[PDB]
Amino acid sequence: MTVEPFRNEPIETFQTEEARRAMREALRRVREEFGRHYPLYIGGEWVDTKERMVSLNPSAPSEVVGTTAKAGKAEAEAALEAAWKAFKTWKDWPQEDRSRLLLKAAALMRRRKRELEATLVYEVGKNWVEASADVAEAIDFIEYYARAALRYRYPAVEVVPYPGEDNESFYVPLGAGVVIAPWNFPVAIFTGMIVGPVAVGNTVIAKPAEDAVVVGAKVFEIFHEAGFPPGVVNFLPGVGEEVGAYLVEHPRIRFINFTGSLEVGLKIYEAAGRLAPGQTWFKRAYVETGGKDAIIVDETADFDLAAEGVVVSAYGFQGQKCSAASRLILTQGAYEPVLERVLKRAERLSVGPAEENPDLGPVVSAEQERKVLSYIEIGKNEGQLVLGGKRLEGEGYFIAPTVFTEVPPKARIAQEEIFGPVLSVIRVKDFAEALEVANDTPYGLTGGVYSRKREHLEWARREFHVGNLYFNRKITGALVGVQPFGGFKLSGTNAKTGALDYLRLFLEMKAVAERF
Amino acid sequence: MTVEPFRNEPIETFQTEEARRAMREALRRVREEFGRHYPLYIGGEWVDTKERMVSLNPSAPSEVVGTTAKAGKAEAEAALEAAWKAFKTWKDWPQEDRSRLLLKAAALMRRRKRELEATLVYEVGKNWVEASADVAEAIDFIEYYARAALRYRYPAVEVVPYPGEDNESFYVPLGAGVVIAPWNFPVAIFTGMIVGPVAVGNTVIAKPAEDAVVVGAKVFEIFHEAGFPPGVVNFLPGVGEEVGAYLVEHPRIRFINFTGSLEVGLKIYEAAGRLAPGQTWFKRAYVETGGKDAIIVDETADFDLAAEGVVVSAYGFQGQKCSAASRLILTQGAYEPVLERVLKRAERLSVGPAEENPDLGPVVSAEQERKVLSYIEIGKNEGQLVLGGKRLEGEGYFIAPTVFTEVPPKARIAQEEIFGPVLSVIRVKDFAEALEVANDTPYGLTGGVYSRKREHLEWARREFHVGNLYFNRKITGALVGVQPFGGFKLSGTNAKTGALDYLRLFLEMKAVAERF
Amino acid sequence: MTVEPFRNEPIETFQTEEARRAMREALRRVREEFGRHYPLYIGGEWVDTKERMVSLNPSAPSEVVGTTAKAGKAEAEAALEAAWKAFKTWKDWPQEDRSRLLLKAAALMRRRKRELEATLVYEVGKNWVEASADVAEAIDFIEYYARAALRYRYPAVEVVPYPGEDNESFYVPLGAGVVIAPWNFPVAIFTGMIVGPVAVGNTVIAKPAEDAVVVGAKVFEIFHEAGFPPGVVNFLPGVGEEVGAYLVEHPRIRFINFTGSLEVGLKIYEAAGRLAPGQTWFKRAYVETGGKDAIIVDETADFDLAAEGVVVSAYGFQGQKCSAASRLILTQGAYEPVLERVLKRAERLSVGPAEENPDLGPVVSAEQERKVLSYIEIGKNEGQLVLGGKRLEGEGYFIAPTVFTEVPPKARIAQEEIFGPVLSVIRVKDFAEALEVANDTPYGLTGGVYSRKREHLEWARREFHVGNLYFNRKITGALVGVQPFGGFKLSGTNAKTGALDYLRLFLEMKAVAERF
Ligand SMILES: NC(=O)c1ccc[n+]([C@@H]2O[C@H](COP(=O)([O-])OP(=O)(O)OC[C@H]3O[C@@H](n4cnc5c(N)ncnc54)[C@H](O)[C@@H]3O)[C@@H](O)[C@H]2O)c1
Ligand SMILES: NC(=O)c1ccc[n+]([C@@H]2O[C@H](COP(=O)([O-])OP(=O)(O)OC[C@H]3O[C@@H](n4cnc5c(N)ncnc54)[C@H](O)[C@@H]3O)[C@@H](O)[C@H]2O)c1
Ligand SMILES: NC(=O)c1ccc[n+]([C@@H]2O[C@H](COP(=O)([O-])OP(=O)(O)OC[C@H]3O[C@@H](n4cnc5c(N)ncnc54)[C@H](O)[C@@H]3O)[C@@H](O)[C@H]2O)c1
Ligand code: NA
């Protein structure tokens, strides 16, 4: 290795005066720039368009945080041309050179962390720590993938020798692909899905989520300053079902890296399986979708520890996480003790403008507000509302921490991803039934168990069918490198982000033999 | 390791009297066995049906090598139930135990080698050495995967540690899947696609090609004797578009391992991308399809060495290989010298009943014969026929080694996989044009270059876009472990058989963290 | 690895106000609980007895620090049954699961360090830092053995392969054994001797020293909360020659892990060699006994550094350490300079109630006081008393730092382990004679050399025959992992604690071959 061993970027807690001062300064700089317009980034240059995308402040939707260009089919085609032209030479860069480029990007991002964090606060309503964790994760993806990519360098395949011959197998990148990202982790996931494929030689056309186009543009300002060759990375903010679908169905798109809703992921995976007219390969599509994550608590657990972890997992970033605890499964002996503690903690949570660092900011948009409120109405007919369940005052999309109890395992609110601050509590007889209820959903992303009984924990290790399982701690915030992230079943294709295996997904192998 | 390092099973040449004696006895016994009936194998037992599949001797089609039961939807459902029930416990077997079972199966197959080779001679018309290579490859897959699987044993993932926590990532098998195999390597590929997934904990429903159902049943006799638990491996001979498609489209099939034509592979990949009613996961489909493989020869090559390798690559097993040289690209200075040598060697090839151990046996079936002859008629109007191009006398499906020259790069016979003893010779100006022509097809499986010029060889290593490239030697017969096998573009999903990476395709990862 | 690399638990120095405040709080909580009664722990539950054991405060013996149940033959039998019943399934736990259980225990102990330290202060008279070092060492044993155990996981043995066979060798635990511990390191050694064997699959019946039954019970409160299955670890406070001897001589005790006096160790080793009626194995007995440790100082040493290290080594925890410097061997040129400095430092040492953090607390009991005072009387007839040698005022067993000079190498005080604050100074001619005198004792545990001459240090490295040798530093306080601890000759069986080799002592090997 030529760099220090990987370490996770510390997540700022803002406990010091200097950290708070630095954040206030960043917040001011960011809002003073609310009038900025960010063009598309294609072939190494910023290119503007006639139409535009508008980004609002979810804590004050009448306030615009910025606008960006809007990519249509023509811009998608221009991006494709630039990406394939660039691939021709980018694929030949020594891996050491590509990895150093990522390391430079990581250093530049680290120097602009407060700015990016402040942008997350205003654009998608993350409180201070949720924003810092997001940016820190993005830096982690760059640092981790830069190092991981070297593990695949020419010629990396272990083969069996043969007399009188040289047998050499090695990996090569696939080509130009499209990255379609979500709005909930607009810096971290957006960055990771882009730099992983790019690190090993692929080129990318990135389509940020409509609600986070501004922060996505700032990430590209970093890529531009880092010096990625023209066409290696392209920025195409636009409408998902328009430019996103166009690229997904295109015969010249080699792979698709998607993170988002199951509904969209299903369409993308299906489209990826079709041979478009003139297409000359089998497309690879990686789709990480939602989850309906549960935390199980039995009668042997530390109830206070459990209540704390549950509240953090269910309401962090207003529950807008694919890893959020949306189900709380309690065995009979743990039901009362835990529910009472969860209710007491949850009722003390503050909700308000994200910039004031409340426990909960607003949900991301009017559309999300509509969906969450709709599920709350459905919940009133399936379970018992015991806390919250109301829109709070203000133009911002403030929704109160909500709790439904005595919820049937098969209830819609106990099966469908609400993606809001809504927790469904389910009462079960014992641990075995708790596991049965935990597994009985179409998903399998994250899960947790609070218990002191070793046999229950190890039992869950083997049978709680989720890609990321946590014992006696929160089930959100998977750290790059430490906890490969990705689920089972309808939670996705199990493309483990922040892990060595992730990069293999964007490579193909060639075996060359020479008989002397 | 607890066993000797992997070594490839020696391919018998039958040059010694002992080898000839053993082979003659095996052929005689298999011949005396003609007409035997083999049932389906489901849940650990042989199960017969009313309908049947008939397997003819391509060297004398009036002779029935044998018959097998025929699986329909009911049998597919019974196999699904058995496979999923078996998965529940087979997945928990220590890896060391599963690997030992494969090693036992390999030992049993090795002891029945002559019999299996003799069955290939009669059922699919392979001469003696082609049959021996097929069986040897099958043994290699078992031996190799048994060892490779141990590299993924619990807990195999390299992760970054975190203070106060245990972070453990490990692989787990996917579940029950279907294996759909071709008739050209009915022991090797059939065995490989089955034991790879099974080695790491998956269960399989195997669908042999219609023309090779008897040898497929004999492989299952070996699996049964080895002791695989009931339901771990199931044998379902039947019609591809019927029972095969039924399993591919089934909501309860977890993965599909397919090797066959591009036409079928395309349908399978598309179907796999769809969420069948009630399906709870994203299906994984691996499809290794055909190719239109070329051997390039420039003016610096050893023309005699090249001619020999071209004839072997083009006519081995009647050109019925996904790796067969179906295109011969000659630079101007190599054109006359190489073509004349290829023609002289090819015109001396013997063609006759496979049991006689001729250079070429018959093509596999009446329909394959019809298709090949049809392509020959097409070729007569695209290029210049300079050798063969006719069916020979006799009931068997004998086609003479055929050569077309001055063939346009875009001609149908220079683009479409004929899968018969038909070689298309293309004359180009220089090595640069040779590479352009070689890459200009929808495929990318195998390729070869005969040249003494280092710069041309290394140029090809970087730009001859095929998954398996060979220099100054034949382009067929990839050895397990030595040459990871799999292509690019429409030649498949690049699932490299006989390589460590192959098993990862049938596993998913789980990350479990415990905060102490 | 799935956890961070091993690091030694920092030893608290109490230099900060917070640390002192935390200790005072712990001391108060502990003394407020002096009236507590601690039952035996058998088969996962606390079981009381009719008779009891009383623990006194050596700094104020009229004050009881607690009482515990008292195990007799019946309780020993109940413990044996529970331990063997538990072994049947505990031995089958995956090593990863057993190691995680130890890690949990370590985390729980770390959270109760001040409480345990305060208990050591009041129960066995350790000053603040001696108590913190003891607890830190215990945590270290758990953390170290948890990691070390994984190095022996199935199948760990390196063997030579053989054609046509799978040859697999692996380790398995021995069964149920007894741990008999000393009172001087009642948390550290008690913990280490228990968790090492348990980590790899054995079950244990632990017999704490009579003078430290209370702190031993608290360690078991930690094991109980951690969740060790019923019967895996059992707590049997009681009389050594009663319940201890009973278990040692029992035909159903598989191994004995003992740390204590040579007198007892000799009896245990002899008894272990006998086949008790009905016994079906050869018992393994590990006995780490005393020492008569010397520090050599030559004329080239840093006399002030040497005097400091000598005082620390001889009087730390009142010299009640198997590693304590009880002999000071000085070459002619170093005699005066070093002795004068040692006397000046030693006369400034405070002695009093342990809770006030004096340099020396009291010896552990009336019996130890009697022994130490008796050796002081013997010393007056063998050497010259130059410092201390008196019982100090107060009911506590306070003995003053003592120094005897011009002591004959063969004198009883220069040969027998006093286990008190008594240093014997021996004058020798040169370094060679210093080594001869150092080696001429029945022991061989710890030793030290203060010298700047490389040739003398390296000479000692090769010929100063002790298991743990230290140059230019104290000879006590061996750290887990850094300095494998254990001696030669009558200092024991050389079972190196805090080292990879320790766990091998509690395993046996099986070799299984399968001919395919
Ligand atoms: N599994 C994970 O790792 C993970 C992590 C973060 C978010 N998520 C999921 O993301 C969802 C929230 O994100 P969202 O609301 O942005 O998701 P979404 O599916 O509505 O949109 C995701 C992205 O796809 C685009 N898009 C929309 N329709 C499209 C179409 N037909 N074709 C192509 N692109 C299209 C959008 O513009 C956006 O860029 C939740 O379901 C959550 O569980 C998953
Ligand atoms: N890439 C490789 O490794 C590789 C190796 C060997 C053969 N092949 C290819 O295989 C082909 C020759 O094999 P073949 O003639 O048996 O191929 P094929 O595609 O016609 O049939 C392959 C298998 O699929 C079944 N099948 C047919 N239609 C199906 C459907 N709709 N759904 C599901 N299963 C269906 C058949 O019964 C048989 O078991 C050639 O194109 C050759 O290049 C590829
Ligand atoms: N070598 C080492 O690692 C090491 C470390 C610490 C202490 N020690 C030694 O320990 C001694 C001080 O400890 P102690 O006074 O508790 O020792 P001890 O030998 O008097 O007693 C040790 C333990 O054995 C039990 N015991 C006593 N007689 C027994 C018998 N006949 N059969 C079975 N068990 C019996 C006691 O109850 C106690 O649990 C010193 O000699 C010291 O050198 C050795
Ligand atoms: Na916004």
Ligand code: NA
């Ligand atoms: Na046939």
Ligand code: NA
């Ligand atoms: Na005491």
